[PDB]
């Protein structure tokens, strides 16, 4: 016989035939999957009285456990079973309700914001419902669904109930973001955006996808705060960190201006004791809302290579020092310019100064290299100024050895961030980055949390899925959609700090990047490591920047340039194609295919809605949803593994079946050169920066030890090709 | 270890066919001349062609001047120094003959219990447990090498939290008894507390009149007394969360592989014994023997009962069809029954148990191979019906053989204490949930047999028990007991080089085998064990297996450890033996 506990409490006989039909349904269209295999694995686990939801988890996991490179369609079998389950969990049936009935219920329960019902009529929801294709749920992979279920879909944390499905998520994000559009265009934009996201052409960050449509207005996922050399700014900085990490934002802290250990008694304000005690304070601030005091809350802190304390700073996350010599749960960005590198090559010295003893040196470091050189050499003379000398080879080695040993000491080329930038370095210098080293935006110190004259940069992110687009001209519509969706959100969201609101309203800065690059290269038969992708990458990223700029341009015509457009190099008719690192000419000869001069005039005349548009970020979650390779990164392998409380989640790289040979796995790359050239070619067009990785497999090197010679040569190759930043250093375990 | 030889000089004095013919010759030596040499021939044939396997003590000893062949004994300790001493003495005597020991020590009153006058039970169980351990190791060179015991106690014993961690690595030395295994005794109510997320109340057996007896014999009565005593605040007690208690047990089971489980209700609701006269209240070293015991008050106490078991196995790979089991059952049952009279008893209580109940434990080897050649597997339920068919035939024919023998020579003295005497059969008392996982019909005339048993009795109170085999099955080149092979080739170290053995008919069956670690989980196996337990008189050395690399972050979830435990119980599994965790 075998009985089954129903949804209520009622019990009825098992329907093995029903189970078979769901499985047959789920397996439709798929290849190399065995329904009967799934049955064998799951049925043996059934017991008299088993509840109905547990029969469901059982078949899902059974199908999931057969995901492999040889049978990758088990990703989709499991996915569909999981979807079906989630329909039942949310609606009591497979068919979703009508959009209007769903939104009304959710507003009742307080799970959707009621402005959706204010801003749209029943007629309009009826119409939106005709845009919706709930069958698009059938296109998720299993790992994708686990992410939807884990962090996207509106649900109860406590009770475990799921209240929506993916197409309502998608339609309602569109609905919310475009809700102030004139009725003439509104539902057009809603439809087009819903299409773009539901078919995976555009990806959005987790805070947006989980939050937009709910009663919250907190969606800011990364902030950039600059600390001034005063207790007031130190306090303000700290306070702003606390406020933001409580909303689970990642933090980039510029702390390079804090004067060094042993600097004169400023009267009261005690800067004698130096940087580290303050660095520890930012770290507790960053961890102020984390359960362990480690788990959650993340920050990257920035300082210049020539800071008097640099030797002490470089080793802040090294394993064994005294406890007061370490600040281990924050990452660092070491800031470097051309002169520093020149000292290395010439085998000369680097002179270390406290920023407080060298008038104008700090400002020049970012804004004006000739001026930096003048002041630097001037101050190396002057023996009245407190200074210290280190061998450049010694200093760089210390940095590179800490970078390698932790993977988490990062690099920012501050000249590149300002010579090749949408900002006039004399008005709005880029003097730091964010958590992940792809955001490059102006900041100003605060003298108090609510100081109206400070500037905090936030960034507003999205990505094009280069695998989901048949040709580059699709980027025009997608750029219109992405730029407009993000621009609306800037007005839509709230700002916990006046300085953050200033930055956003003033410059309206966007950071749109890409996912699925590796797959895209593979299907064009290119690779990372051999230069075979150089021209395609030029072609690809020209199209991205062109169309992004075009979209933001049209939007400026329609709605006005951003308040501080006059502080951009774009305002002076300067384009990314004018200011890039020239050495790039030697490694690609792709012509520009778009009318950049037409655009140049149109930008000078009408301005840009957004001061920046593009930034190449990492993606973990965004790209699992699309079954896409992460950002611009080569896959570590063909199948990725995640632990979860529900079993091992496997995801096979897209079209493994036809592309296994076309892929170039991370560790197949003979070295970093090809990749870094691709990053450089990308950086030609990108407004901000790129989360560029460096990788080393010890087993490719004599005695399994990575030579410093090579660590430094890749560093210099980065610089030569105008790479703004370097993020993680991956060293292979094995 | 089989052939008669000189330990000192290294000379071998016989060959395998003399071993075999002479074991037959000895065991059947009192048969009437009319039948004698027939039985000898048939048995010699059965063993020499590997259809029947016998334990090492028998195969090495029967024909030699010795009369010591007892390989595992079951001793119950009472709550008194006299019984503690007797128990210890009986252990010493038996381990000196290299027997494995099952010790029931669950009745020893807990630490802090009233001064009984003189007899000092204030200090509790552990100091006595250590004493049984030195007893068990009293004849072992290192003090570790040789001599093996499993000790039993109830889950609700006041000291249980201390007992569960007796083989844990680092405690104080006086908190550990590491070179003995344990069986934790559980019934339905204990499990119910777990599921309902309730408490388990811990009692010293000395403070709860009738609770101990009821635990094994009568569940309704157990529940009554248990809930009654949870009320009464005059009685010393202690409360633990069932989830906490079970987890402690399951985590110790997993970490050592050697904390075992006995479902004491199943051992008595589905049993050849009337639980009101002869309850099964313990098991043996390897958790397949389920037989009545009585405490001794002195080594030579005529009123004690020690269970021994007398073992053999059918080689399911050596038989072309199940009807061969009729002759083989006749042969096996008669050979073992003769040995009971043939062998000696170092302790009066052991002789009582054997002469009284004449209990046999005949099992199987080569199950995996048998499944493979029938194209079945362990893990998917594909073997359920074949297993039902197979084990029905085994129990039927065993019962039939023992029946004929009772006609010829008389039922065993204490047959009246069996459920068989009251016309109750294993097919009457099994766990009903088994109906949901197999629909094989009975193929034999169980009602014909029922009457014949009521009329004539059984020579033997038990017949069947599924034991592990290491040595018996290597001789036959057979897969061990009911176990799936860890791999296709096994390796042993020896002073003569690496011994390799390839699984039988690897050539034609490599794909048909399902290796231990190929099983997605334990469910299919446990259902097979349950189907087996329907017919088997005693218990089964059932294993549970876990490959960490099948679980997120390589860690086995307690959720799953507990679900397999409950699956065992649901399908009426009497005991669980080793927990194997894959190294790698």
């Amino acid at each position: 016989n075998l009985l089954v506990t129903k949804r209520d409490g009622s019990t009825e006989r098992i329907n093995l035939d029903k189970i078979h039909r769901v499985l047959d349904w789920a397996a439709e269209g798929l290849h190399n999957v065995s329904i009967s295999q799934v049955e064998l694995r799951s049925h043996i686990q059934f017991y008299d009285g088993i509840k109905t939801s547990d029969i469901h988890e059982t078949i899902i996991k059974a199908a999931a456990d057969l995901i492999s490179r040889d049978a990758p369609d088990y990703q989709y079998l499991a996915a569909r079973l999981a979807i079906f389950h989630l329909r039942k969990k949310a609606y009591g049936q497979f068919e979703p309700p009508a959009l209007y009935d769903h939104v009304v219920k959710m507003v009742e329960m307080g799970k959707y914001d009621n402005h959706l019902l204010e801003d749209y009529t029943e007629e309009e929801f009826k119409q939106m419902d005709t845009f919706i294709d709930h069958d698009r749920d059938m296109t998720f992979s299993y790992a994708a669904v686990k992410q939807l279920e884990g962090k996207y879909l509106v649900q109860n944390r406590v009770t475990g109930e799921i209240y929506e499905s993916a197409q309502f998520l998608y339609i309602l994000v569109a609905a919310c973001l475009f809700s102030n559009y004139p009725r003439e265009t509104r539902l057009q934009y809603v439809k087009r955006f819903y299409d773009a996201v539901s078919t995976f052409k555009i990806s959005l960050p987790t805070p947006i996808m989980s939050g937009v449509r709910t009663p919250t207005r907190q969606f800011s996922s990364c902030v950039l705060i600059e600390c001034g050399d005063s207790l007031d700014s130190i306090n303000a900085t700290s306070s702003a960190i606390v406020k933001y990490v409580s909303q689970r934002a990642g933090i980039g802290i510029n702390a390079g201006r804090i004067r060094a250990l042993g600097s004169p008694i400023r009267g009261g304000e005690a800067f004698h004791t130096g940087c580290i005690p303050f660095y520890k304070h930012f770290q507790t601030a960053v961890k102020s809302c984390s359960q362990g005091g480690v788990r959650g809350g993340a920050a990257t802190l920035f300082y210049p290579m020539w800071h008097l304390e640099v030797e002490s700073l470089l080793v802040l996350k090294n394993n064994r020092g005294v406890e007061g010599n370490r600040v281990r749960h924050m990452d660092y960005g070491v800031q470097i310019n051309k002169l520093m590198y020149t000292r290395l090559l010439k085998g000369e010295d680097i002179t270390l100064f406290s920023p407080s003893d060298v008038p104008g040196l700090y400002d020049a470091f970012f804004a004006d290299q000739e001026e930096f050189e003048r002041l630097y050499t001037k101050y190396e003379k002057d023996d009245s100024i407190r200074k210290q000398r280190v061998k450049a080879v010694e200093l760089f080695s210390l940095m590179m050895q800490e970078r390698a040993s932790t993977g988490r000491i990062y690099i920012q080329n501050v000249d590149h961030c300002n010579t090749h930038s949408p900002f006039d370095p004399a008005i709005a210098p880029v003097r730091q980055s964010n958590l992940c080293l792809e955001i490059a935006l102006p900041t100003k110190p605060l003298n108090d949390v609510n100081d109206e004259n400070g500037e905090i940069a936030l960034c507003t992110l999205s990505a094009f899925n280069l695998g989901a687009i048949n040709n580059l001209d699709e980027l025009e519509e997608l750029a219109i959609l992405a730029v407009r969706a993000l621009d609306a959100l800037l007005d839509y969201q709230d700002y916990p700090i006046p300085a953050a609101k200033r930055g956003a309203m003033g410059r309206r800065t966007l950071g749109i990047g890409v996912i699925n690059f590796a797959y895209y290269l593979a299907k064009h038969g290119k690779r990372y490591s051999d230069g075979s992708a150089n021209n395609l990458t030029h072609k690809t990223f020209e199209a991205i920047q062109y169309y992004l700029l075009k979209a933001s341009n049209e939007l400026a015509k329609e709605q006005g340039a951003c308040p501080w457009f006059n502080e951009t190099t774009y305002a002076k008719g300067i384009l990314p194609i004018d200011t890039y690192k020239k050495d790039l000419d030697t490694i690609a000869n792709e012509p520009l295919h778009y009318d950049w001069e037409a655009l140049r005039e149109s930008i000078k005349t009408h301005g840009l809605r957004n001061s920046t548009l593009s930034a190449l970020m990492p993606s973990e979650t965004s790209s699992q949803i699309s079954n896409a390779t992460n950002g611009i990164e080569p896959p570590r392998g063909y199948v990725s593994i995640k632990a979860s409380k529900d079993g091992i989640l496997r995801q096979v790289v897209p079209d493994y079946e036809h592309l296994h040979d076309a892929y170039e796995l991370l560790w197949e790359m003979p070295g970093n050169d090809g990749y870094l050239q691709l990053v450089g070619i990308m950086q030609k067009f990108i407004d901000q920066s790129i989360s560029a990785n460096t990788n080393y497999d010890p087993s490719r090197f004599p005695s399994g030890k990575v030579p410093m010679q090579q660590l430094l040569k890749d560093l210099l190759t980065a610089y030569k090709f105008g790479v703004k930043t370097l993020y993680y250093q991956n060293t292979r375990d094995g | 270890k089989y052939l008669v030889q000189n330990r000192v000089t290294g000379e071998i004095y016989e060959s395998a066919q003399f071993l075999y013919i002479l074991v037959a010759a000895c065991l059947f030596s009192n048969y009437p001349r009319e039948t004698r040499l027939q039985y000898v021939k048939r048995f010699y044939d059965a063993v020499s062609t590997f259809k029947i396997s016998l334990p090492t003590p028998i195969m090495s000893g029967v024909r030699t001047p010795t009369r010591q062949f007892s390989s595992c004994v079951l001793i119950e300790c009472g709550d008194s120094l006299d019984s503690i001493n007797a128990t210890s003495s009986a252990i010493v005597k038996y381990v000196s003959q290299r027997a494995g020991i099952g010790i029931n020590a669950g009745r020893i009153r807990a630490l802090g219990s009233p001064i009984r006058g003189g007899e000092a039970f204030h200090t509790g169980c552990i100091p006595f447990y250590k004493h049984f351990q030195t007893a068990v190791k009293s004849c072992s060179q290192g003090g570790v090498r040789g001599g093996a015991a499993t000790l039993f106690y109830p889950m609700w014993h006041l000291e249980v939290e201390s007992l569960l961690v007796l083989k844990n690595n680092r405690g104080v030395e006086g908190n550990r008894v590491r070179h003995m295994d344990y069986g934790v005794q559980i019934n339905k109510l204990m499990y119910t507390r777990l599921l309902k997320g309730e408490d388990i109340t811990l009692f010293s057996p000395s403070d709860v009149p009738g609770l101990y007896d009821a635990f094994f014999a009568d569940q309704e009565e157990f529940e009554r007394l248990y809930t009654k005593y949870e009320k009464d605040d005059s009685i010393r007690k202690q409360r633990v969360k069932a989830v906490e208690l079970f987890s402690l047990m399951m985590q110790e089971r997993a970490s050592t592989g050697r904390i075992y489980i006995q479902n004491v209700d199943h051992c008595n609701t589905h049993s050849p014994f009337d639980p009101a006269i002869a309850p099964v209240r313990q098991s043996n070293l390897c958790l397949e023997i389920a037989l009545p015991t009585k405490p001794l008050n002195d080594v030579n106490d005529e009123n004690g009962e020690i269970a021994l078991c007398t073992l053999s196995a059918f080689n399911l790979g050596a038989i072309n069809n199940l009807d061969e089991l009729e002759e083989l059952a006749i042969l096996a049952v008669r050979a073992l029954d003769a040995l009971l009279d043939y062998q000696d008893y170092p302790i009066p209580a052991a002789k009582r148990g054997a002469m009284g109940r004449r209990t046999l434990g005949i099992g199987v080897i080569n199950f995996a191979y048998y499944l493979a050649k029938h194209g079945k597997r362990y893990s998917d339920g594909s073997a359920n019906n074949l297993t039902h068919k197979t084990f029905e035939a085994i129990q039927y024919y065993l019962l039939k053989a023992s029946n004929e023998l009772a006609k010829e020579q008389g039922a065993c003295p204490w047959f009246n204490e069996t459920t068989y005497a009251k016309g109750i059969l294993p097919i009457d008392t099994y766990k009903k949930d088994l109906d949901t996982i197999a629909n094989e019909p009975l193929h034999y005339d169980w009602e014909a047999l029922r009457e014949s048993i009521k009329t004539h009795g059984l020579r033997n109170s038990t017949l069947s028990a599924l034991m592990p085999s290491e040595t018996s099955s290597q001789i036959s080149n057979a897969t061990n007991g009911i176990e799936p092979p860890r791999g296709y080739v096994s390796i042993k170290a020896s002073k003569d080089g690496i011994l390799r053995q390839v699984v039988p008919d690897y050539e034609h069956l490599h794909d048909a085998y399902e290796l231990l670690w190929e099983m997605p989980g334990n469910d299919g196996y446990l259902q097979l064990v349950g189907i087996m337990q329907k017919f088997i008189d005693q218990s089964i050395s059932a294993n549970t297996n876990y490959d960490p690399s099948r679980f997120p972050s390589g860690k086995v979830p307690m959720q799953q450890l507990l679900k397999d435990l409950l699956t065992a119980y649901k399908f009426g599994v009497k005991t669980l033996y080793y927990q194997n965790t894959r190294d790698g």
């Binding site: 017991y47 | 599921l195 997320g197 989830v243 997993a254 970490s255 307690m558 679900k563 965790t581």
Partner: peptide, 16 residues
């Protein structure tokens, strides 16, 4: 070895 995470909700359904 072990992950000591246990949910009662899941267990409570089981029929002994």
């Amino acid at each position: 070895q072990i992950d000591s995470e246990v949910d009662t909700d899941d267990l409570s359904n089981f029929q002994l």
